[PDB]
Amino acid sequence: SCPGECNCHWELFCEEGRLCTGYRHCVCPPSC
């Protein structure tokens, strides 16, 4: 049910209307 062991997602973040960036945000759910 999970991509890997944990649930990881690509988070698109923008600096309040300024340029945007993305990083690998992986969270490990206890139901996985």
Side-chain angles (χ1 to χ4, degrees), residues 1-2 5-6 8 10 12 16-18 22 24 26 28 30-32:
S1 311
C2 306
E5 299 177 83
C6 308
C8 197
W10 188 253
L12 192 282
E16 194 190 282
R18 297 181 180 165
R24 301 82 59 180
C26 318
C28 313
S31 189
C32 187

Side-chain angles (χ1 to χ4, degrees), residues 2-26:
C2 306
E5 299 177 83
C6 308
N7 284 333
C8 197
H9 297 119
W10 188 253
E11 300 293 298
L12 192 282
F13 188 88
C14 297
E15 283 287 89
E16 194 190 282
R18 297 181 180 165
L19 291 307
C20 307
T21 188
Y23 73 116
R24 301 82 59 180
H25 182 58
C26 318

